[PDB]
Amino acid sequence: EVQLLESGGGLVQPGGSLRLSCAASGFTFSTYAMGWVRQAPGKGLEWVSSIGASGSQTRYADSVKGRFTISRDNSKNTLYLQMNSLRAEDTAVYYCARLAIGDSYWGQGTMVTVSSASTKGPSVFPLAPSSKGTAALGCLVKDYFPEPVTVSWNSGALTSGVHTFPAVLQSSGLYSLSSVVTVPSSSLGTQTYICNVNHKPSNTKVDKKVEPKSCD
Amino acid sequence: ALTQPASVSGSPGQSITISCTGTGSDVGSYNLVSWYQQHPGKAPKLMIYGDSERPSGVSNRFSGSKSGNTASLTISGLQAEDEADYYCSSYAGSGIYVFGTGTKVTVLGQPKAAPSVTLFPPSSEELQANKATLVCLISDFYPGAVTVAWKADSSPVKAGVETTTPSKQSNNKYAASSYLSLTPEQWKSHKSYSCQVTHEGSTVEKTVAPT
Amino acid sequence: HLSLLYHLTAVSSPAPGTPAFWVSGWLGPQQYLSYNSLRGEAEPCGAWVWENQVSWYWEKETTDLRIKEKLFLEAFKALGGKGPYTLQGLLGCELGPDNTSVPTAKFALNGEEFMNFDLKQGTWGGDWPEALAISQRWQQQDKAANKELTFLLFSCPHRLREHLERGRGNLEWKEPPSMRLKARPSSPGFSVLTCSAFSFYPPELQLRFLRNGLAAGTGQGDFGPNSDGSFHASSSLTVKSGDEHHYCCIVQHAGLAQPLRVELES
Amino acid sequence: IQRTPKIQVYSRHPAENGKSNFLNCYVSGFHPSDIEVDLLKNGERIEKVEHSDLSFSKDWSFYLLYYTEFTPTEKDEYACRVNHVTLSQPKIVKWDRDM
Ligand SMILES: *[C@@H]1O[C@H](CO)[C@@H](O)[C@H](O)[C@H]1NC(C)=O
Numbered sequence: 001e002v003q004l005l006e007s008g009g010g011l012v013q014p015g016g017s018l019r020l021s022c023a024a025s026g027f028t029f030s031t032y033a034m035g036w037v038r039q040a041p042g043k044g045l046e047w048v049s050s051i052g053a054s055g056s057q058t059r060y061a062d063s064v065k066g067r068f069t070i071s072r073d074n075s076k077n078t079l080y081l082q083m084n085s086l087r088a089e090d091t092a093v094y095y096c097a098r099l100a101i102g103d104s105y106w107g108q109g110t111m112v113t114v115s116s117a118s119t120k121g122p123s124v125f126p127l128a129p130s131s132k133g134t135a136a137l138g139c140l141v142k143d144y145f146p147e148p149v150t151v152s153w154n155s156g157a158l159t160s161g162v163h164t165f166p167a168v169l170q171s172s173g174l175y176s177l178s179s180v181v182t183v184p185s186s187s188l189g190t191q192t193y194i195c196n197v198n199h200k201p202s203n204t205k206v207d208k209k210v211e212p213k214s215c216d
Numbered sequence: 217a218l219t220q221p222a223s224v225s226g227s228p229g230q231s232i233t234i235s236c237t238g239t240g241s242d243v244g245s246y247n248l249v250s251w252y253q254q255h256p257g258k259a260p261k262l263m264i265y266g267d268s269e270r271p272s273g274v275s276n277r278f279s280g281s282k283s284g285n286t287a288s289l290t291i292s293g294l295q296a297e298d299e300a301d302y303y304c305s306s307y308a309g310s311g312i313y314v315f316g317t318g319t320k321v322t323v324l325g326q327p328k329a330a331p332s333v334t335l336f337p338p339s340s341e342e343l344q345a346n347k348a349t350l351v352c353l354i355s356d357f358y359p360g361a362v363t364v365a366w367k368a369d370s371s372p373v374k375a376g377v378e379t380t381t382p383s384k385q386s387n388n389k390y391a392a393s394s395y396l397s398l399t400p401e402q403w404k405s406h407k408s409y410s411c412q413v414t415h416e417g418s419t420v421e422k423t424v425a426p427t
Numbered sequence: 428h429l430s431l432l433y434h435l436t437a438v439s440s441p442a443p444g445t446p447a448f449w450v451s452g453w454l455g456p457q458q459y460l461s462y463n464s465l466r467g468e469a470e471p472c473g474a475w476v477w478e479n480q481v482s483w484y485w486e487k488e489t490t491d492l493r494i495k496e497k498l499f500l501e502a503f504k505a506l507g508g509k510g511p512y513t514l515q516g517l518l519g520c521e522l523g524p525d526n527t528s529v530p531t532a533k534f535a536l537n538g539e540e541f542m543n544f545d546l547k548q549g550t551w552g553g554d555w556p557e558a559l560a561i562s563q564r565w566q567q568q569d570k571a572a573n574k575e576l577t578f579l580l581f582s583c584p585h586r587l588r589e590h591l592e593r594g595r596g597n598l599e600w601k602e603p604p605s606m607r608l609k610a611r612p613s614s615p616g617f618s619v620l621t622c623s624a625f626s627f628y629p630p631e632l633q634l635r636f637l638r639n640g641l642a643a644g645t646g647q648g649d650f651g652p653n654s655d656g657s658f659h660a661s662s663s664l665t666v667k668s669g670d671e672h673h674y675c676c677i678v679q680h681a682g683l684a685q686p687l688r689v690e691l692e693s
Numbered sequence: 694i695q696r697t698p699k700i701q702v703y704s705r706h707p708a709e710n711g712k713s714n715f716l717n718c719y720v721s722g723f724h725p726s727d728i729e730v731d732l733l734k735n736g737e738r739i740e741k742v743e744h745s746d747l748s749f750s751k752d753w754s755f756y757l758l759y760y761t762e763f764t765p766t767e768k769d770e771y772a773c774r775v776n777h778v779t780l781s782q783p784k785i786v787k788w789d790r791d792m
Contacts, residue, residue, distance in 0.1 A: 033311055033555050044318040045252070045260065045303050050311035052554025059311040095259060099311065101248070101506070101560035103271055104262035127336045127351065136334050140342075140351055165353055165393045166383040176378070176395055178351050180334065213340070215427060243778045244537060244695045244725045248508045266507030282509065310539065311555050434748055438726065451746045461746055472746075513725050515753055535753040538694040538724040607707045609791045621791040625706050649792075651701045651719040654745065654760045659703050659717070661792045 002026035002105045004096045009110030011119050011146050011201050012086050022079035022096035022107060030054065030074040033099040036081050038092040039109075046092070049081065050099060064090075086114045113146040113201075120145045120174060121204030124197050127178065128213045131185050137210045138180035139195035143172070144202070151179040152196040188212045218304055218316035225322045231292040234319045236304035240285040249287040250305035251280055252315075256384045260303065264289060296323045299388055328416055329389050331357035335411045335422035338403055348403045350396035352411035352422070357382075359416070360390035367410040368402070428455035428598065428629070429523070431587040432531065435492075435516030437499035448496045452488075453519075454590055455598060456630050457656045462492045473656045474597040478590070488586075491578055498565055505564035506557060513537050518544075520583035522591075528584040532575075534561075549576050602628040602657055603682030606689040610671040618668050622646070622676030622689060623661035630658040633679040637688075643674065696754050697779040698723035702772070702788045708765045716763050716788060718773035721756035730759045731774040733785070738774075739763075765790070 008020040022034070035050040049070040050059040058070050069082040079096055091114045096107035122144035129137040141149055151164050158181060167177035179195060189212060197206040217238040226232035241247045249267045252260035262271055264280035267287060277293045291298055304316035332355045338348035354362060360382035366373045376397040382390040394411065403409075403426055410423045430453070437448040450469075452460025459475040462468070469488035471478065499514050506512060515535040520528045532544035534551075542553035542561060549572045551562035565571045591598070604627035613619040622634050630650060636643040646662030653659060666674060676689040699722040705715035720730055726747055732739045745758040763771070771788040 031552070031559060033559075035311070035313070037313075037315070045254075045305075045315040047313040047315055050313070052311065053552070053559070054554055057311065057554050099556050101556045102265050102269065104250070104252075104260075104265075106259035109259065123342075123345075125339045125342045125349075128339065138336065138351075138353075140336070140339070140349060142342075142349060163353075163355065163391075165391060166380055168378045168380045168393060168395055170378045170395070176349075178336075178353060178393060180353060242695070244513075246506075246508060246510050246512060246537060248506075267509070269507060307556070309537070309555065309557055310541075436726065436747070436749070442727065449747065451748045458746065458748070511725075515749060517751075538696065538753050540753065605707055611791055619791075623703075623707075623792055625704075649701055651703060651717065651721075652745070652758050653705050653717060654715060654743070654758065659705075661703070663791075 002098065004098065004105060004107035006094065006096045006107045006110035009094065009112050011113045011115060013116055014086060014088060014114055016086050016114075017082070017084045018086065018112065020081040020083070020094055020096075020110060020112070022081075024077045024079065024096075024098070027098070029077045034070075034072065034079045035097045035099050036070065036079075037095045037097050037106075038090075038112075039095070040089070040092040043092075048094070051079070083112075086112075088114050090114050111146075111148055115146065117145060117173060119202045121199050121202035122149065122176075122197065122206075124195070124206040124208045126195075126208050126210040127180065128210060129183075129188060132188065132212070132214065133185045134182050135185045135188060136180050136182050137193055137212075138178055139197065139208050139210065140176070140178050141167075141197055141199075142176045143170075143174040144176070144199050144204075145174050146201055147175060149175070149177060150198045150200075151177075153179070153181055154192070154194055155196055158193070218306055218314055220302075220304060220317040220319045222317070223320045223322065225324055226291075226294045227324045228294055228296065230294050231290055232294060232321065234289045234291075234302055234304075234321070236287040236289075236316050237285055238316075239282055239287045239304075239306055241308070246309060248307045249280065249282050250307065251278075251289045252303045252305055254301045254303065255386065256300075263302075291321070294323055296326060296388055299323050299384075323388075326358055326388060329356060329358045330418060331355060331362060331392075331413050331415050331420055333411060333413050333420045333422045335409075335424050337409075337424040337426070338398075338400070343400050343403070346400060348398050348400050350398065350409055350411070350424070352394045352396070352413070354382075354392040354394070354413055356385075356387070356389045356391065357415055358389045360384060361415070362390075362392055363414045364392075364394040365412040365414070366394070366396050367412065368406045369408060373398075373409075429587070429591075430455055430519065430521040431583055431590070432517065432519035433460075433492075435495060435499065435514075435518065437496075437502070437514040438511065439503045439513075440511040448499055450492050450495075454587070454594070457597070457628075459590070459594075460488060462489070464496055467493070474600070475590075475594060478594045478597065480593075481589070484589075487582075491574075491582065494574055498568065498571060501564055501568070502561045505560045518579065518583075520579060520587060522584070522587055528580070528587075530579040530583065532579055544575055544579070546576055546579060549573070551575075600628055601682040602626065603680055604632065604660075604678060606676070606678060606687065608674075608676045608689045608691050610666075610691060612668065613665060616668045618666050618671050620646075620664045620666050620671060620674055620676075620691075621661055622663075622678075623659070624678055624680075625659060626653055626655075626657045627660075627680060627682060628657045629681055631681060632658070632660055634660060634662045635677050636662070636664050637675050637677055639673050640675075694724055695779050696722055696724035698728060698775060698777050698784075700773060700775050700784060700786045702786050703792050704765070704788070704790075705760070708790045710765055710767055713762065713764050715760050716771055718759040718775070718786075719756070720759070720773075720775055721750070722754045723756075723777055723779070724754050725778070726755045727778065728755070728757060729776040730757065732759060732761050733772040733774055734763070735770050736772070
């Protein structure tokens with residue numbers, strides 16, 4: 001019932017700014033201190049900042065002192081984190097956290113990338129099934145930056161047997177991933193398969209229908 | 217300033233211990249040690265608070281203790297789903313936390329699972345864009361160690377190869393993928409391309425051909 | 428001066444033969460009450476030993492502090508861990524000229540203020556997790572918040588008004604200070620002048636220095652108590668050697684009919 | 694937290710040689726509450742010393758008055774020895790008759 005939703009993650013140039021938000025629900029927000037904990041890709045947890053239940057007291061790690069400003073709006077049930085003077089090493093997933101002595105509730109995280117590199121939206125290509133048993137069809141999502149990319153099938157109606165693979169970071173600096181769904185062979189030609197590719201940082205949204213090719 | 221061993225390992229049903237160093241408080245001050253478990257692609261889960269207390273609905277098998285500059289987490293009756301990253305945490309009061317280095321736990325003796333391979337040729341739409349990408353997907357293998365080799369017919373092709381490191385999954389098995397980039401001319405200039413995935417001395421191969 | 432304040436302290440690891448919890452009760456600037464967990468009974472202090480008192484008055488004080496004793500120690504179970512911890516309470520009320528009360532309910536952990544009691548909501552609260560945990564542990568105890576509010580809004584103003592109509596002499600006690608102005612050598616061609624006030628009550632007192640009658644400074648000073656609740660003060664000033672007798676000290680105090688001029692000793 | 698004690702030494706009444714008096718050591722502003730205080734006559738601990746209740750100020754720091762009956766003398770040397778976790782070594786403050 002306790003829910004925490006981070007918003008505002010994205011790509012920022014070094015020296016720029018970005019305000020994260022966290023929408024809290026399922027508890028009396030003004031009673032609890034709140035905090036931000038970040039995790040760099042493939043690295044440990046780093047506590048960033050905390051704020052008192054009423055917002056009157058704030059705390060900051062040495063690594064973010066003077067650049068970040070945690071704040072709070074209790075009437076709106078929202079936690080904020082204003083990041084200024086962003087440096088590359090600030091790239092991380094940023095978790096919203098409800099602070100307590102005997103329990104710990106977190107959000108899902110939001111991705112912050114600090115890079116001089118420009119954003120690029122992916123090309124989407126269908127991976128047609130060769131079967132006509134089970135069949136494997138999918139979508140190739142090629143050459144995008146930065147992470148992440150979200151992929152659903154048939155607007156979320158298809159979820160069973162779907163496997164979205166971790167992206168590859170290529171030498172070009174761009175990422176690529178594939179999403180494959182394993183379906184009954186007999187369903188081909190009758191069942192429509194559409195992959196929904198959304199890449200927020202570049203406002204790229206693509207629906208690719210995957211057709212069966214049958215040149216006997 | 218909290219420090220943890222990088223990894224610890226154990227066999228099913230045994231007990232392991234993860235140490236945390238740096239948990240000392242000055243005179244007139246205090247701290248409270250928490251232990252967090254993090255499974256792949258997921259937010260951390262609080263396992264121990266107040267040095268040695270278990271939240272509601274945390275397994276009996278987890279216990280904690282603090283003693284001066286050292287706190288320790290003990291996982292007894294080790295199960296496979298205990299495989300994760302574990303972080304000690306110190307709350308000094310007044311809203312100040314510090315997180316430990318992190319310790320990856322591995323559970324020995326898990327069954328070897330060979331990888332399933334799926335190879336996709338370059339699509340018609342991509343070839344229309346004067347580009348071609350071969351997509352090799354590798355699923356549900358353990359241990360997480362594979363090598364990939366690409367073949368143009370029978371010749372080893374190393375240029376244009378981008379292979380991920382194996383990423384761990386909830387089921388404790390691993391997934392990876394490898395992408396061969398090639399011009400449309402090279403693609404049609406051979407009779408077949410193969411993706412060879414070697415895992416624990418055993419190779420799984422898939423082949424595609426231009427049509 | 429028209430204030431009644433309880434100073435409560437609990438320690439998680441008291442030295443052997445020392446109380447885990449003790450309380451001093453104050454009517455303005457003088458202590459009237461004593462309580463510790465080792466003896467377990469609230470006692471009068473100072474002049475209040477001779478205050479004509481109603482039956483069961485100190486039994487009631489003892490009853491209330493005993494409840495607060497168990498609660499303060501319960502707060503350490505809520506925090507868990509090893510500590511050690513110090514929990515301090517600042518509870519009481521203050522009468523205004525309108526015969527209305529204003530309550531005070533603040534708490535400190537390991538020397539830092541971290542929690543108060545809201546009398547409009549009847550809950551304990553604070554900005555950090557340690558506050559919320561202690562608050563939640565006390566909410567659990569039945570009628571803990573009820574007794575807390577009653578102590579502040581009924582008992583304190585009642586106890587305060589009782590002591591006003593029957594210990595009125597103790598609070599309006601006016602003991603003028605005994606004064607000394609001594610000099611001692613301090614440096615090549617310099618002296619320090621120390622003006623000291625002895626055994627005075629109330630503690631409000633002003634010391635200033637005059638040179639040949641003209642203003643010459645406050646000096647740097649220090650207040651302190653005596654064993655009987657009266658006070659001591661002194662200020663010092665650096666003067667030219669051989670010029671000491673041209674100075675004097677003027678003291679203002681409610682126990683003096685007018686400002687008193689004090690000159691150097693003989 | 695920690696707070697270093699403040700130490701004040703003074704007599705209850707103006708010092709008159711040969712006349713009985715009270716010597717005070719007022720230790721204030723310290724945290725935590727564990728403190729150790731000795732009154733000294735010519736460097737030796739006075740045995741019959743009393744003290745007030747351990748109390749605290751509005752900033753939550755603790756204070757404490759130690760006192761003993763005594764008779765000043767032009768030669769005799771009085772001091773207050775205080776030990777606290779914030780002190781590397783015991784802190785000895787001599788009674789100056791001027792205060
Ligand atoms: C203050 O009010 C109470 C009634 O609430 C009354 O009994 C008491 O005598 C009053 N005290 C003064 C000094 O007026």
